Structure 1
Amino acid sequence: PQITLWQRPLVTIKIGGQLKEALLDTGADDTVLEEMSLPGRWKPKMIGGIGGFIKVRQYDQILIEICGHKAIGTVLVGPTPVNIIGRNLLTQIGCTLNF
């Protein structure tokens, strides 16, 4: 798809058997998801944003289906206010900025 930006660029994702909505976020290096039940190992990590830092759980090699595209990579889980698909996954679905 081509997505204009008059509204937030939200897409439906499937991850860990659950359906969610997430923001396609070119400003995010990494993918950060709201508190959710994810299976497997995880490493504690801290990540920084506009208002400070949050502690997240890092999961690697996690499969996400984003608007019918499959990607695998690192997902961070924690107290983000919105689900963010970051550049680590955007590159896998071939996403580009155009103007």
Structure 2
Amino acid sequence: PQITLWKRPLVTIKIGGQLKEALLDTGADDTVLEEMNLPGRWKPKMIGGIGGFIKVRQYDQILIEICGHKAIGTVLVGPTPVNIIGRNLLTQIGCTLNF
């Protein structure tokens, strides 16, 4: 589809058997999701943006479905105020910017 940007580009995602709302965010290299207790091993990481850094847990090869489109890749889990779908997954669903 085509999503205009009058409002935040929020979409439903499925990850770890849960449905959630997340931003399609061309400004994020990677994907960052609200605290959730995923199984498996993880690696600590610190990521920075406006206001400074937050601590997150890096999970690799996680299955995620973004508005019907399947993808698999790294997800960072931590105290983010919004779920952020980054370019690592936006490429996998064929998402582009156009003007």
Question: What TM bracket, shorter-length normalisation?
Answer: over 0.9
SS in 2 for 1:27: coil
CA distance in 2, matches of 1:4, 1:36: 29
CA distance in 1, matches of 2:72, 2:86: 12
Structure 1: 4+ residue segments shifted above 4 A: none
- CA offsets 1:37-78 (integer angstroms, 9 cap, x no match): 211110000001111001100000000000000000000000
CA distance in 2, matches of 1:92, 1:50: 27
SS in 2 for 1:61: strand
CA distance in 2, matches of 1:64, 1:39: 14
Measure how far apart 1:98 and its partner are: 0.2
CA distance in 2, matches of 1:68, 1:40: 25
Give me the TM-score of the superposition, normalised by structure 2: 0.99
SS in 2 for 1:54: strand
Gaps of 5+ in 1: none
SS in 1 for 2:88: helix
Sequence identity (%): 98
CA distance in 2, matches of 1:40, 1:31: 18
CA distance in 1, matches of 2:19, 2:38: 13
SS in 1 for 2:74: strand
CA distance in 1, matches of 2:69, 2:56: 25
CA distance in 2, matches of 1:97, 1:75: 22
CA distance in 2, matches of 1:14, 1:37: 14
